[PDB]
Structures are given as C-alpha cells and as structure tokens.
Amino acid sequence: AKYTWDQELNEINIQFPVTGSAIKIRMVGKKICVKNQGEIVIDGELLHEVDVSSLWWVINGDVVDVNVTKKRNEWWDSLLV
Amino acid sequence: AKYTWDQELNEINIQFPVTDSSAIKIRMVGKKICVKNQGEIVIDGELLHEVDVSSLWWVINGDVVDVNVTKKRNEWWDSLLV
DSSP states (O other): OOOEEEEETTEEEEEEEOOOOOEEEEEETTEEEEEETTEEEEEEEBSSOEEEEEEEEEEETTEEEEEEEESSOOOOSOSBO | OOOEEEEETTEEEEEEEOOOOSOEEEEEETTEEEEEETTEEEEEEEBSSOEEEEEEEEEEETTEEEEEEEESSOOOOSOSBO
C-alpha cells in the first residue's frame, strides 16, 4: 500500500510517507497523479467529482496530507474507480 | 501588492490582509513557499535563501496575518524571493 485515505461528508483526504522538489500532484477532472521522488503513489481516476481548485497539501513530519473538496456531499465506497 | 515583508538578522516576517477557518493556507517545502487566502494566491515563489521550515508560524492580528520563519543563516536578504 502506497497511500491511505479517509473522508468527511464533503472532503477526501489522502496520506502517504515522504521519501525520505520531490512531491508532484496533479488533478485534472477526476484524473489524479501523485508522485514522490519519481515513484508513482497514485495514478488513477477518483470515484466521483471533486473541486480541483480546492486541492491542497502539506507535509506533517514524515507524512504528506492531501485534501480536496467533493462536488457532492455523499460517502464514497472507494477512493478510485 | 498582495503582501509586505520585513526581516531581523535571523528571521523573515511576512504580512498580508485577511479576506474562517480554512481560508489561510501556508506551505513551505525547502525554499518553495505557497500562501493562499480564500483560494487567492498571496505568494507563490521561492525564498531568496534557506529557512528552517519547522520554525514557520503564523497568527492573525486583527485584519492582518503575520507569518514568521527563522533563517538558516544570519545574513540580511536583499529581497524576499529569488
């Protein structure tokens, strides 16, 4: 497992460890690409639509925390399609 | 001008006006600095010299956000950004 995720009714959160500049994150529509030092963390399509402009991330110690707001307030069964 | 800044020999201070409670987003990684206020970019650049990113702190004083970070080296900076 390269990452974990959790959700609030209106938001998705993704976490992964900093190895060890390096952090590249792009969302276009539902497509999501997260790389860390060239290694792919996630390369897929989110289950539902998000507000791509709301995308934010920070580093807390050894962990990167990524947050994006959902378009629709509903629980997601999974992160990706 | 979206912000102002000043310095001590060992510290950088950045100020900008407010507009709750996820409105203020601040990230520094290495020398890269991103400050957003209600989604609007305040700063998006690279600091002139290295700072201790762990020392980064900010607070709201009335209508003004004050950001402080400690310089790695004790020297005057000609500019805030590269």
